[PDB]
Structure formats: structure tokens, C-alpha cells
Design a protein around this nucleic acid. Structure first.
Ligand SMILES: [Zn+2]
Lengths: 60, 85, 101, 50, 119
RNA sequence: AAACUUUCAACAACGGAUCUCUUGGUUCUCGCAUCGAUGAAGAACGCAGCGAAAUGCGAUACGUAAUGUGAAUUGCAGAAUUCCGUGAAUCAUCGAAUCUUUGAACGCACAUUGCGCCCCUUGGUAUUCCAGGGGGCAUGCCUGUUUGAGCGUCAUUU
RNA sequence: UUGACCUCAAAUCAGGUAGGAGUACCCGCUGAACUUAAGCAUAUCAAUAAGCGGAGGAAAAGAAACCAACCGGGAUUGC
RNA sequence: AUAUUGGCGAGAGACCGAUAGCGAACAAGUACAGUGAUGGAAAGAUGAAAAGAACUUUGAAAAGAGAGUGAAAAAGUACGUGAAAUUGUUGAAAGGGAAGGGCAUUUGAUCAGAC
RNA sequence: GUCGAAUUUGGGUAUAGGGGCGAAAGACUAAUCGAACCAUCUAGUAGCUGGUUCCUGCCGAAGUUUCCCUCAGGAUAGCAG
RNA sequence: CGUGGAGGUCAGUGACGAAGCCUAGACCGUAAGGUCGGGUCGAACGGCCUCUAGUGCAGAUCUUGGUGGUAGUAGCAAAUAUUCAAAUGAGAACUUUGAAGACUGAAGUGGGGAAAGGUUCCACGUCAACAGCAGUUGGACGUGGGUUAGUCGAUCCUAAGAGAUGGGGAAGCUCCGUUUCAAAGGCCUGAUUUUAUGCAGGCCACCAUCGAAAGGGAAUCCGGUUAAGAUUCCGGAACCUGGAUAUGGAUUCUUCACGGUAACGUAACUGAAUGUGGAGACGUCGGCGCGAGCCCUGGGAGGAGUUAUCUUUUCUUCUUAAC
RNA sequence: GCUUGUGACGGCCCGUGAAAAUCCACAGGAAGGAAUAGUUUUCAUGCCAGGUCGUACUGAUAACCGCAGCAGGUCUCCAAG
RNA sequence: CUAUCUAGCGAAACCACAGCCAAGGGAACGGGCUUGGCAGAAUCAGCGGGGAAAGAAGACCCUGUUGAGCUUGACUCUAGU
């Protein structure tokens, strides 16, 4: 679950996650939140587990 | 029945937001702003609307570029950079 | 006073004509070159009702004399004209009902 | 309405951010006079007309 | 603290580019560790340092094209003078000092003679 | 005779007059000439460690660079080396920049955050399909250029 | 046949320029009525308010197809 | 040489002083009203310094009573002073369908002068 | 009362103030209609109504003349200071 | 006589208390007013000679603000109706839970939406204000969480209409006019693989664009899941469009399929320009046939209710999506 | 039986009850093709992608409009014995 | 079901000052003035005689050198033709 730029689309989000985190995106879901911000639901392939990546970033 | 019962039948907005001013004055079917005259090239303003023009005149906004022009005049409209005097 | 009802008709705001279902401009064929010296044979495809008038209209089909084309005409049907008839349009066309002379 | 344009939902987000009381520490400022939020708006009292 | 602009001027465009993407990384974990701790005023210094790096980078390529277009007419419009729309349209001093020979001869022959009146 | 009503005093209420103030207004004088397609004025949305507003600013976002002064900012927290300093400041100054989306507003649109085309480049086994980054594609008009149309028209041919 | 001239086009052709804002003061254009006349219509408000076009630091005007009738004056502007 | 309630920067006044002076001394062309064009307020003053009342006690709490700060809480963010209408408490007096007033004096309360 | 149609109704759209729309009531045109609303001209004019702020001293009227589209007003003589 | 301000003068008063305010206490003046004493208060203010005016209020259905009697009064009575107990709390007619009694009675007081609203949704804490009694409760207050799409919509088309352009009016803001007195535009295939697309060609004549979340329209279903979201997440199973692409299959020496008399059939089974046809694509009412869901009902396999008496009994589960 | 879909008919009209995008088919014969090998991607299977904005909730004797938590007004779907 | 009594909550109209009559005179119909009758605290539920009760600067009538809507062989003009 990521907070993404309002100007982004799902192609940029998929590419950006790959560059920053060296992980593969399976799908992207976007919703503009009621506070005028974009939230992204980034699902990794079964090759990767988000549990070991979320704490790699530093939030868990 | 022209009072309270008729007031329950107003649910279709005659105006929406205006791109150029934003005052909820873009008449939808006429496609013309009621307040700022949009989408005319000029801006609607009148010598009988003295109060109205005072509301939407130069200075009532951020003045994003015209503020600095006055001191730029004082410096002779100079160019370059200061040389560590 | 106030302007009167026969005065308000010229603004053409609500006093226009109702033309959603009207078939088309029921005109004659053009006088290009093939009628002023000869004729051209045509076929009646269908005779249909016209909203607004009480006279039926005919769909008369001709072959284009200058392109591989099947230009179709909207005539006012003569009483006696039937679907499948042959229509002759020219100067030397016979004196028969349905012909354009 | 449920189906809405981005202008409307964007301008509602602006009005949702602005809907909360005064920050507490501002009244502790030197030479402060603002005692509360005079532009607070609630959905039941006055309408936004957007 | 932050970065010193006068230190950024010495490095080339390749070293600044690494530093800019280096600072971009650093601000990214500051944002990640801010959401847990109550306050973090260090993010301010990194944001300003990125801006300083970007600004010093910008002047290096902007001067690179001034020297590329040095000594010729038709400079890029964003590198010309921003005096004033009216003043920019104003006639030059050479074009305002053009004079006809009919007046040029009169100026040479008959200027205002400096005269005093005492005696 | 109490109660109650009325009148006055003290004290206490209700209320915000008066008195005394004033970073405000008003009027008069003096001096100056400086918006915008190199994109104005205006509008929308955003930006602070903790701000809703005002004020400031624009994804470099209460700001960057440069110059001066020279130790603060302050409601709290934090940072201190930046303190005999190429250096604090919500400081002054400001000549370099950034300046989201719009707006005369300009690829076509707009009650849509809608729909194309061209140029360079990158990826998907790809001039053609999809995607990314960068630069473009309004109208009137002047001067110049180039490709043209007209038995309008000259000369030359064969 | 070829090369010109005239005229008219096209181009995301090279270079530009107009727009919009502000508009107290100026140059035009359009133009009322309230009112006064003890009514009211010409008249007056007023060659004004409103409306439109167009500039500057001032604008505009300006060096006589002028004024005068004197023993002539001598751009314009303002008092 | 003339004009100038717009812009910029100044100097002033037998001008106004918070219902005045610009509509606006304050987050004012704001809050707010209307579909709209437009319409449009209210609102300044603790103290030199928050020193903005530690602590005890009654109460579920708000608060009360003490204690304290302060030159002053007869200055407690309902804050300079703090009027009137209107109100409570105490004290005094009068009152058989109004009250209030004038001349004159009795009675009660109070009081200046003069010695 | 009418209730299968000269029916009921939503959304879109067109028609704008001496103008619209009217199976016609001067009806309706945003609780406003025998001429909507908003701003400006505009402190519009009124022979008419109402009000018009401190004390003491001295003096002290008129409702009558003539003219006036004059009769709830003015001008004029008179009365007063 | 009094008020705001100005020139002069009293080397005027004052933090040892100016101004203001209150005072059935005193004094002066016919009066306008003036003076003093006491309380409160905290920073400025007067006498006299003159100057000046935004200079004196009881009223204007005066203006703005404030406050009474009325008055603890009118009232808080439409929409069938509440009761007992426990829990919580300082406090319960009103909150929660249980029980009982009722109502809406399927063109509902039920379950979803359009317009509109904008966070009202959900959790936690919480009752100063609001819910015209109350309040521990709330659509209130404080703090937060929450809206996941190739398939649902918009996005595309056009309708009534709106509206640039080329032009024509108009002093002018602007009006007409949408194919009109326009040199109005763009797609396929070649040719060279100095290569960009110049150059081979032919074809095309309509003609900006905006305008419907109920019209037209490519394609997704079931089950599960949250405090709060789902035809959007998860699991499973699909389809559509666009684009690259190989194998199998199909067909040919009678070069581009066979079979059936036929209506026609199949797994395919070369077909450029051009032209023709269809679908998109359509009123309403009447009765009649068929389908689907529901309703009714029998046997059987389970569960619940009544059982002084009777009742092989009353209620309830037995389902099957897109493709 | 109720509700709803659908079919074939009938009645009715001086009313005869939209448009386009898009999709397919047909006629036509341009061109390209076969033998040690060719051709079809309207057959099947196999590969990749599908952007942007909306999506919570009420929808009304308390969330909309009526100065309000107002006996008013506000279009529609499902409908048991 | 109200009205009534209670707990809670809690307005408005209107108000010169007020509230017992007879007659008189008086702006020709007094609550107040004069002469009389009378006259005892504080009050509750009703009531519709009075307060010429309240609600509106009479919409009828008239006046004003105040209008407007409409009409026409009014006066003076005008678009169009
Ligand atoms: Zn506008």
C-alpha cells in the first residue's frame, strides 16, 4: 500500500516500484482518497513476499 | 402552491463552476459566465458595478509577477549579478 | 399593449416546423443532361407515408450516368404509381402516368 | 452524488482538510489575538454551494 | 546545515547527477521513518539541499548554451533581456540616433553656441 | 401585623455608555513613470516538524541562488557547529533561477483533470501495436524565403 | 520547349508584431433619462451618466489655407 | 509651461477617534444570503511583567471555600474604567379602585453655618 | 373530479422584460407581474405628513388687500422686531 | 451657561492620585449651570482673554445597541402504545440487553438508486453547546479510519439544439450564417533500399467541434471476505478489443474445398478498388401460445413447536451462476 | 394464479410511431500463388497489454429543497399468505 | 385529545400613564376633570359588555398643476410601408 503522486498512472507506478525496490508488480489499483491524494495497491508476484520488503523499507 | 411545495422542486443547478474565476457562475446552457463574462476574451466589468470591480481588480490576488516590477524599476532594470562588494 | 400572436410567429422560436420524421426534401430529379435530349429509366422501390402531409411519397431509383452509382430520388407519388413500376424521365419519354415530361 | 466530476471531489477534499478546530499552540504565540476558527463549517449549518 | 552551493560549483555534471539521485534516496527513508516518530525537522535540511543541488546544476547547463550561442544574434528567448514588454519593443539608441543628412549638415555647421552675457 | 407594590441608599447583578488611548481612516502638498505571447491581472489546487486562516511560496513550494549586515529563531520540540565565521536569522537586499493547473491562453476539447498528430530516444522478439522521457503542432498580419496555380501574360522554340 | 513578368496561393518555411489586464488624468465614438421650466412638448440636465474603440507619463494640441483693421500681432498649451 | 480620488514613494493637518473615521484599526470585500448579476456585517483596551492562581478542602464534574501572585483580583483570559434602563439581597417608609406634583406646616431621619 | 388518454412525469433543449409564453384568468415568466430581478443615474422631485437639540431679559403679530391654471401655494400691501 | 478643537497666559491642577463614574451630604446663581465633601478609579486635565465648529434632544411608526411588563403565561395535544427487570452511571420515562404488548402489512415505517448533499459512513473518547423534557445516547463534540474495475459508468455517436471557420453587417462590445459566391482535405499500394519519404500512380468529395451517467453502444459470473469497500479485493471460472506470432489443422499439378435434386450443411476453405444489402433501427392497445421467478401442493431425509385431549400434525432446509 | 420476458396475430390513425458511430454480408476480379514444393491468422491452440476520472453514505415525518432534526415538495426498480 | 394541577422547557402581539361607576360639561359618546355613589390585602378557573382592544401612514370619497395600465377622429411624433 503506497501513497503515490496524483499525476501518476498505473504504468509509471509499475515501473517505479520495479526501479526502487527490485520487485515485480502483478497489478496496480488506484483510488483518489477523500483528502485529494492518490493511494496505490501494488500486488507483487508470488516470486516476492511483501512482508520481507515492507520492513526492508523500514515500516512494519 | 407557489411557496413551500414548489421549493421542493429545485434540484437542477443552473450554474456550475467557472474556469476563469471559479464563482459558480458558468451558466450551463448559455455556456457563458455570469460574473466575469467568460468565455469572452475580455473580462466583464462595468462603471455601474463599482463595488463589483473593486472585488475583482488588480491587487486582490497573489500578484505573482507584478509585485517585483516596481523595485526592478528602481535598480534600473539591471542585469548580471552582484560581485561581493 | 403587447405584441400579438401573429406577430410572435416570425421569431420562429416555438412556431417552427416539426421535422424529425419527415422523410426528406421531396424534389424532382435534376435536369443535368440525360433528360434534355433523351430519357433515363427508373424503378420505384417503395411508396411510404410522410409525417406532416397526407400524400404518399415514392422512392424512385436511377442509375448514375457518370459514375458506377445508384442515385435515388424522392418524388411525390402519383395515384396509380406502384412499387416495382418503371419510371421514364426525359424529353422523349412516353405519355404515361409516372413519367417525368 | 455518487458519480461526480474530479472538480467536485477535489474541492470537497479542500473543504474536508479545513474542517477542524484551531491548533492549540497558536494561541500561545506572542501578540496573538486569534481565539478560535471563525471559518469552521459543518454540513448541517451552511452549504458550500459548489 | 545542508549542502554548500560554492562546493557544488567545482564538481562536474556527472558528479552532481549522482549527488542529486543520492539525496533523492536519503529523503525517501526520512519520509519512511517520519511516519513512526512524532516529529522530524531534519527532512527540511534534505529538501533544501536537493533544491540547492538542482539550482547549481541548472546554471551549469544554462551557461553552457550562452557560450554556445555566444557572439551571434538570435539568442534563445528565455536567455534574452526581460526588461519590459514595452521597453523590449522600444527602439534602440542606434536606431533612435539615425539622422538625415539635411539635419546632419545643420548639426555640424550650426550647433547652439555657448554664449555668456556680461560685456 | 406579614406578604406584595412603590421610592431611595449600600452591596451584588444585567448591560456596555462614558473617560483616557490608537501600527487605522481621511484630506492636502511633494516627487517619480514601471504590466502582458520572453505570457499580465485574476482563479484553482497544493507546499511548514507540529497551521485552519491571514501573510509567503510553487513539486527546487512560509521557499533555492547571489549581495549586505553579522548571531540568532522562539509557542513547543529539535539542530548546534554556523559562532575570530565564504556565516544564524519568519533579517534586509535581490541582478540568477524554479514557477503545479489555468487564465488574452495558443494542437483539438472542457459540466470530461477527454481526444489526436509530428520530431528524438528507451522497453516490450517492433517505422506500423502498446508504454515512458524530452521538444513541438492557435489565429490575423508585415518583411524575406521556398514549392506552386491562372490561354492573366511576354519571349523563345520545333 | 524553356526562361521571365503580373496576380494569387501554401508551408509547424526565417524573423517578428496585435490581443488581455489595469483605464484617476487624455483622444475619439455612441448616448440618455431623473430634474428645472411651479404643468409640459422646443428648451435644460447635457453635447452629461451608462455603453464601445484607442494611448502616454502626461496625453492632446502645436509652428497659421491664424488673429486683426492697429503706428499691426505672430506655434501651441496653461493662469 | 497644463491635468490627474489609478500605480509607486514620501511629508503633513485648528480632520475622525472604535455606532466616529474608508464598508473594513482585527485571518474585510472576510463570515454570511441568492440560481444569478450582486448584496455584505459584527468584532480594538488583563497586567510593567502571566507573575494566568502551586497547594489544602467540599463536589460526579463544572465549580465553591481557603492558600497564593500581583501596586491593585473594587484587574482572573466572561479581564482598564464600568453609566442607564432592568434585577436580587439588606435597611427605612407609605399604601380602602392608580401613582407621581404644588403651597403650607406637624412628625421622623440627617445636616451646614455661627459660638 | 378525472383516471388509457387534448393523459401524467423526469432529463435535455428553445423562447427574455414593452420582451417571452398564454385552451385567454391580465394569467405565468424563481413566495415578485396590468410590464421580473440586480446595479447605476440617485441624496431623483414633492405647493403634502412627521421631526427639528441650552437659559434668562425686552418687544410682539396674522388669518386681512390685489394679482396669479389662483382656492392645502406664492408674489404683493398691511400688522411685528 | 455648556461641548470638540486652535493662539496667548496662569513658570495653572495632578501617580502624596488627572479624567471618568456614584452619592434623598454642603454651598452659589432667577436659570442655563458652577463649586465642594465622601466612595470608586488609574494618567492625564482646567481658570481667564481670544479663535473655530461635524457644538447642547423627549419625541421624527427617528438610527444602532441594550432591557422590561406581559410571564413562569400562550403553550410543548395530528401520525393507535407502552410495561416489567437487569447492566452502566453521580444521576435512567427516554442509553444497552432480555422479556412482554403492539404497529408499518410488500404502490411498507422493507431492500436499491437518479437529482442534491459532502463525510453525514465506521471506530474510539465524550456531554460546555444543539436534539424546544431529559440524556450516560446522537446525523452533536474531539481524534482518527474508510471508496481498489479491460468487463459497472463516463470516455464514442447523434437528436432537438449549441457553435467556430470562409465570408457579409455593425462606429463598436458583437450579429447573421454551418456548406454557405473557399485553391477547404487523406487512405492504400508501389520506387530507392546515398534514404527520408522525395518521387511511380490511381481512389476519394463528404466536410470543425460540443451536445443524453434514462437514447444508440465490444466484453464478468459465482462463492468468500471488512468496524466501515466490492459485478472493483481474494479463490475459482470466463469473455472482449488491440497487437505481435509458431505449431497442428485446412487446401493446390483439375492451382485457390466438398456434400445435398432442393431449402441448405461443415472446423477452415485466396479476393484489392468499387458498388449494393442487412443488422444497429424503434407506436400503442386487445386477446391467445410459450418460458422464467414466485405462489400452491405430494412423498422422502433432517431440525424446531404444541401435546389435559386431538392432530401420520404446525413451522422450517433440500440451491445450482456467467461462460 | 401474480409479476416479467417472448412469439404469432388482430384493432387503431388526415398520428403510421429518431439519428449516427459501429459490425457483417454479398456483387467484382486487381494481385499473388503450386511440386520436392506452396498458400490460408473469417479453424483450433499458444503470447502480451488494456490508461484517466467516479465508486463510502442518506435518498428522506432527521443526511436533498422548504430560515429547522418543518404533518409540505421531490423521478424511478423488486412486491409474500 | 385538550383546557385544568404538577416536573422540566418556555415565546409573541401590545404597552403615554393607567385601569369602579352615574350624571354633567367638554372636540357635540371620560379611566383621569366637577358634583355625587362609593371604596379593604393577595388572588384562581371562565367570560366575551368595555378598554370607540390588536393587526395596515383608509384600497371608498375628495384634494395634488403626483403616477401608471388601457383606449381613441385627443395633442405632438415615429418604426414600417
Ligand atoms: Zn467566471
Amino acid at each position: 500500500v503506497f501513497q503515490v503522486s496524483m499525476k501518476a498512472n498505473k504504468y509509471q507506478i509499475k515501473k517505479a516500484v520495479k526501479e526502487l525496490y527490485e520487485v515485480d508488480v502483478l497489478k496496480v489499483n488506484t483510488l483518489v482518497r477523500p483528502n485529494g491524494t492518490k493511494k496505490a495497491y501494488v500486488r507483487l508476484t508470488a516470486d516476492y513476499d511483501a512482508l520481507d520488503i515492507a520492513n526492508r523499507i523500514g515500516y512494519i | 402552491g407557489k411557496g413551500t411545495p414548489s421549493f421542493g422542486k429545485r434540484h437542477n443547478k443552473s450554474h456550475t463552476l467557472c474556469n476563469r474565476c471559479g464563482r459558480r457562475s458558468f451558466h450551463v446552457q448559455k455556456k457563458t459566465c455570469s460574473s466575469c463574462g467568460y468565455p469572452a476574451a475580455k473580462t466583464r466589468s462595468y462603471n455601474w458595478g463599482a463595488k463589483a470591480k473593486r472585488r475583482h481588480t488588480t491587487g486582490t490576488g497573489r500578484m505573482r509577477y507584478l509585485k517585483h516590477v516596481s523595485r526592478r524599476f528602481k535598480n534600473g532594470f539591471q542585469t548580471g549579478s552582484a560581485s561581493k562588494a | 399593449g403587447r405584441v400579438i400572436r401573429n406577430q410572435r410567429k416570425g421569431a420562429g422560436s416555438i412556431f417552427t416546423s416539426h421535422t424529425r420524421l419527415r422523410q426528406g426534401a421531396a424534389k424532382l430529379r435534376t435536369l443535368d443532361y440525360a433528360e434534355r435530349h433523351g430519357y433515363i429509366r427508373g424503378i420505384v422501390k417503395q411508396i411510404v407515408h410522410d409525417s406532416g402531409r397526407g400524400a404518399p411519397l415514392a422512392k424512385v431509383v436511377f442509375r448514375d450516368p457518370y459514375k458506377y452509382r445508384l442515385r435515388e430520388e424522392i418524388f411525390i407519388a402519383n395515384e396509380g404509381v406502384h412499387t416495382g413500376q418503371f419510371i421514364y424521365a426525359g424529353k422523349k419519354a412516353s405519355l404515361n402516368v409516372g413519367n417525368v415530361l | 452524488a455518487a458519480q461526480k466530476s474530479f472538480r467536485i471531489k477535489q474541492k470537497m477534499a479542500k473543504a474536508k482538510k479545513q474542517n477542524r478546530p484551531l491548533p492549540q499552540w497558536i494561541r500561545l504565540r506572542t501578540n496573538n489575538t486569534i481565539r478560535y476558527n471563525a471559518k469552521r463549517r459543518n454540513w448541517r449549518r451552511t452549504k458550500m454551494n459548489i | 546545515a545542508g549542502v554548500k552551493a560554492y562546493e557544488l560549483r567545482t564538481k562536474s555534471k556527472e558528479q552532481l547527477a549522482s549527488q542529486l539521485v543520492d539525496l533523492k534516496k536519503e529523503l525517501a527513508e526520512l519520509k519512511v521513518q517520519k511516519l513512526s516518530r512524532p516529529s522530524l525537522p531534519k527532512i527540511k535540511t534534505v529538501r533544501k539541499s536537493i533544491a540547492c543541488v538542482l539550482t547549481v546544476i541548472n546554471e551549469q547547463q544554462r551557461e553552457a548554451v550562452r557560450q554556445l550561442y555566444k557572439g551571434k544574434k538570435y539568442q534563445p528567448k528565455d536567455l534574452r533581456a526581460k526588461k519590459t514588454r514595452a521597453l523590449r519593443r522600444a527602439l534602440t539608441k542606434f536606431e533612435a540616433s539615425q539622422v538625415t543628412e539635411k539635419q546632419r549638415k545643420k548639426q555640424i555647421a550650426f550647433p547652439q553656441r555657448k554664449y555668456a552675457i556680461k560685456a
